Every structure is written in structure tokens, then in C-alpha cells.
């Protein structure tokens, strides 16, 4: 292994499922809209874990995926200078990370005002988009609001998935948070501590690749990656990827 067999100061955080080529071959381009929930109750450790989770989730985005980050507490707003799904290249991801690290927790929560913002941003076709795999990531802790009406009105034929994350070590009700994922094609993840940050994003990628599998041999096409530096040092390389079913 390239530099981390057994060496001090040097911890091996490599995980193949997080590499650009794997994330490229494991699913199709996304339209994420990370709904952070910066309300009062998420302050303290839950907020630190939420911002670390959002950064490590933006890290699983390519240049073909489009992303925006919103945050809601009794009213929803974007966290950054962007107001629509922007391409997830290096500079936009850095802007979103710098805006998320500046986020503060205060106020009551309104899930309907946040999901309305999420769906209304995912229905904005005036911008360039990846018209595929529309997603909402809810980085809450827990609550008592399923908001069945807003999903019924905005996401009826279930074009948009909903992945709900219960970030933090707490004891609030996780019933609506586990329900939102079920009714809306999604999956429910738990991130109780730093160390569970790094696997649940890999897992949403695991979920997104079902319709790719159900399209048996149309999906087995070779895709070439952007020019990245190889893990085991040989400089600039591109890599072709083919999923294995």
C-alpha cells in the first residue's frame, strides 16, 4: 500500500467506496439538496457532527452532480451565495463547505417550510442541471412532524427521493425521520459520532444504484473519470469503470 502499511503520523483513511471512480460507476449523476436543520436543539455537538457530515457528503459529489445546501429553522434559506442547484465542482464545493462551517443553530423547526424550499429548488429548470436522480438529504436529529401533506403535494408520483439522517447522540423521536425515508424511496441513516460520518454517504450511494441494476445490461457501459492523481503514485491518471452486478 502506497504509504500507509504501518507508519506513525500516517493513518490510512482510504476506502475504495469513496473514491471518485467508484462513486462514478456505482450510480448516475445526482441532484442533491442537502437540508441542514440548524434549529436550537441541534446546537452543541449535533451541529458539529452535522457540518462534518455535510462536508463529507459534498465530498461524494462529482462534476456531473449538482448540489445546493439549504438550512431551515421556522423559515428556510440557503447557506451560501448560491440560490439554485449549482455544479459540484471544486470551487462551488469549497464555497458550500465554507458557508456550512459558518452555520449557527437557533430557533424552532418547521419541516414544511424547509421541504417546500427543497422541492421548489429541485423544480427550478431555468438553471443547468443533471436532470436525473433528484434527491433531498435531511440532516436533522429528530422530531414529531412527518409532514405527510407537503410530501403529498410536492412529491406525489415519487420522482424525488428523501434520505433522512439522524445526526447526533440524543434521544428525540426518530419516527417521522424514519418514515420520511420510507414513503419517498429513500433510506434512513444514523450518525451518532465522528467515525460514523464516513460510511453513511457511501451507503446513500449504495441505495441510488438500484435502478441502474434493474436495467441489466444497458447500465454496463464504460465511463472515464476526470484527471486525478493515483492513490499509488503514478501522477495524472484517468480510469474506466464498469459496475459488477
Amino acid at each position: 500500500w502506497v504509504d500507509n502499511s504501518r507508519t506513525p503520523n500516517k493513518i490510512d483513511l482510504y476506502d475504495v467506496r469513496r473514491r471518485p471512480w467508484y462513486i462514478q460507476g456505482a450510480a448516475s449523476p445526482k441532484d442533491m439538496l442537502i437540508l441542514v436543520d440548524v434549529s436550537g436543539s441541534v446546537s452543541g455537538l449535533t451541529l458539529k457532527l452535522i457540518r462534518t457530515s455535510v462536508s463529507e457528503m459534498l465530498e461524494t459529489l462529482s462534476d456531473d452532480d449538482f448540489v445546493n445546501v439549504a438550512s431551515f429553522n421556522s423559515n428556510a434559506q440557503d447557506v451560501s451565495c448560491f440560490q439554485h442547484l449549482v455544479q459540484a465542482n471544486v470551487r462551488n464545493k469549497k464555497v458550500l463547505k465554507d458557508a456550512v462551517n459558518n452555520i449557527t443553530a437557533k430557533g424552532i423547526t418547521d419541516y414544511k417550510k424547509g421541504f417546500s424550499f427543497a422541492f421548489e429548488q429541485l423544480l427550478n429548470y431555468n438553471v443547468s442541471r443533471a436532470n436525473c436522480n433528484k434527491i433531498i438529504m435531511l440532516f436533522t436529529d429528530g422530531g414529531e412532524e412527518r409532514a405527510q401533506e407537503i410530501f403529498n403535494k410536492y412529491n406525489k408520483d415519487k420522482k424525488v427521493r428523501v434520505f433522512t439522517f439522524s445526526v447526533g447522540q440524543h434521544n428525540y423521536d426518530r419516527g417521522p425521520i424514519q418514515w420520511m425515508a420510507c414513503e419517498n424511496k429513500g433510506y434512513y441513516y444514523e450518525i451518532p459520532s465522528i467515525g460514523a460520518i464516513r460510511i453513511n454517504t457511501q451507503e446513500y450511494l449504495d441505495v441510488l444504484g438500484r435502478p441502474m441494476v434493474l436495467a441489466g445490461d444497458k447500465a454496463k457501459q464504460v465511463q472515464w473519470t476526470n484527471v486525478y492523481l493515483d492513490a499509488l503514485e503514478l501522477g495524472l491518471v484517468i480510469t474506466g469503470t464498469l459496475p459488477v452486478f
Binding site: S28, P29, K134, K158, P211, L214
Partner: peptide, 17 residues
Amino acid sequence: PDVCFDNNVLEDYTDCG
């Protein structure tokens, strides 16, 4: 990209967690 795969009806939604 020209082609992408989402929203397949044969998909098994019973696996939230």
C-alpha cells in the same frame, strides 16, 4: 451524460432502515 438510470418500477422500496 446522455443516459442515466433512475425511477425503476420493479425496485423494492421496503428497505428504509
